[PDB]
Design an enzyme around this catalytic site. Structure first.
Site, mmCIF file in Angstrom:
data_model
loop_
_atom_site.group_PDB
_atom_site.id
_atom_site.type_symbol
_atom_site.label_atom_id
_atom_site.label_comp_id
_atom_site.label_asym_id
_atom_site.label_seq_id
_atom_site.Cartn_x
_atom_site.Cartn_y
_atom_site.Cartn_z
ATOM 1 C CB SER B 117 -0.959 0.001 1.176
ATOM 2 O OG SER B 117 -2.017 -0.879 0.863
ATOM 3 C CG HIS B 138 -3.309 -1.891 -3.476
ATOM 4 N ND1 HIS B 138 -4.050 -0.737 -3.327
ATOM 5 C CD2 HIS B 138 -2.898 -2.231 -2.229
ATOM 6 C CE1 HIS B 138 -4.080 -0.387 -2.046
ATOM 7 N NE2 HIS B 138 -3.398 -1.280 -1.357
ATOM 8 C CD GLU B 150 -5.679 1.571 -5.905
ATOM 9 O OE1 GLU B 150 -5.107 1.162 -4.864
ATOM 10 O OE2 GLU B 150 -5.989 2.773 -6.081
ATOM 11 C CG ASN B 188 -5.308 3.305 0.654
ATOM 12 O OD1 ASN B 188 -6.424 3.121 1.190
ATOM 13 N ND2 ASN B 188 -4.429 2.326 0.460
#
Lengths: 280, 280
Positions: B117, B138, B150, B188
């Site tokens: 991340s 991801h 992702e 995020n």
């Protein structure tokens, strides 16, 4: 309360009118030209009979809603309203003039609320002699559906005014939430920088539009992607809120992207212009 | 691609394994102690029992999915695999070692992927002689449920490696999204600062916790409020991401609030410690 004056027959204004009227309130809506006034009463009529056309309500309902609503271009009909909700131009000097007038016109009990997205309830209040009676009452588009009302206390807003606006919200089927006035209040302060962050991501070559939007939908379970949400809110409204957060706080954290600005300048404002982040 | 090697048996690797295996890929999960590997398989098994009870899969599917999963401690078992996905700890000197090993071990064709991340894929890729086949993949917790992946291209990630990882994501019923490596990717980068915004609002006395959360659910149709959501993600993870964003960008726009940093220091990390913004 039984009677409500609503300024602005724009799309928020019209939604506010319907939200109050549909739940049994008498509503006088006021705008600058009766073409505007007529347009809104139309918007609502459309709205309502789309509902009748899903069994949601009946024509007996549709008609009793619409009988509760009058139109006017004259501010002076606010005199006897128990509540005013101002959904007019997001301009402080004007708002200040509007509220100064309502103060002279309305009975001493009338509570004067703004639906302002961004602006200072306190400063508006200060144009009046009834600061204790001025408050923010903030709805979300489309106002008939969105259940939240942000009830924003200015510095001088009294416990009683708050309580009344809180109760009014309940009786029209919304959920009020208390906010001490600060820039963007709660929802937009969180929500609009989210959209702005999506436009930085786009500006920076990180990902393309549809991907950004699928990411928030499928990665965070958001009901819409931020770029589409943008196009629904109006990119000009988005821009304006980011500029207000930045200007109020002085904090570059809230700086709008150049890209958002370019789009606003181009008149690619979203749905309502047929073009925003997406072609409609 | 049929063969996947997954590093790490913590709940992200386990969840991932399950995602690949529930759609027919053969999967080896590897970790450092055999006890860890077994917690991972036990996790997946409890997860698959949940699905059986919810009548979402059958027992037959359950056993069938478990049957395509082999645990190990032997990194060498990756050599033949089509794809490696690493979900080991978020430390760069280690990742670099891990990818450098896998580079030696693996057949020239193998794609090496990191679920990181917040570390740089490009930087990890540079520890190999295979950068063109290094990439981010991801997932979002819970990996077996969350449809988004992702797909993060480092600077050297080939189009071919990208296209392969897109197809594979699609094989497993996930929606891949192309992201050119940048801090926080898409999700995020938007979602975490949103949570951080809520903390500032709270810090500044604008509204209370319950109200901030009610406002986003009711004002924006978010599935959870941001603070409740910070508690679910983990406040340590939130804090850490904000720090990464700030450190990577040099932009004080991404500065964590003192209050977030105070809650982390208290061990008020959210659901996982029985207390974050709320008590559990």
């Amino acid at each position: 309360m039984k009677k409500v004056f609503v300024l602005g027959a724009g799309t928020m204004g019209a939604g506010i009118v319907q939200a109050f009227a549909a739940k049994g309130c008498e509503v006088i809506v006021r705008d600058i030209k009766e073409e505007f006034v007529d347009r809104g009463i139309a918007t609502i009529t459309k709205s309502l009979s789309k509902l009748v056309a899903k069994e949601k309500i009946t024509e007996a309902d549709k008609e009793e809603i619409l009988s509760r609503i009058s139109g006017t271009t004259d501010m002076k009909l606010a005199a006897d309203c128990d509540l005013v909700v101002e959904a007019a131009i997001e301009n402080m000097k004007i708002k200040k003039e509007i509220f100064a007038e309502l103060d002279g016109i309305c009975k001493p009990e009338t509570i004067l609320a703004s639906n302002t997205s961004s602006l200072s309830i306190t400063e508006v209040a200060s144009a009046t002699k009834r600061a204790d009676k001025v408050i923010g009452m903030h709805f979300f588009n489309p106002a008939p559906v969105m259940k939240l009302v942000e009830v924003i206390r200015g510095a001088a807003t009294s416990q009683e005014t708050f309580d009344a606006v809180k109760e009014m919200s309940e009786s029209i089927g919304k959920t009020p939430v208390e906010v001490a006035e600060a820039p963007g209040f709660v929802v937009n302060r969180i929500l609009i920088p989210m959209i702005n962050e999506a436009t930085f991501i786009l500006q920076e070559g990180v990902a393309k539009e549809e991907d950004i939007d699928a990411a928030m939908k499928l990665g965070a379970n958001h009901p819409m992607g931020p770029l589409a949400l943008g196009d629904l809110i109006g990119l000009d409204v988005c821009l304006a809120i980011m500029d207000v957060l930045y200007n109020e706080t002085g904090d570059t954290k809230y700086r709008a992207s150049s890209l958002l600005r370019k789009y606003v300048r181009a008149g690619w404002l979203g749905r309502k212009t047929g073009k925003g982040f997406y072609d409609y």
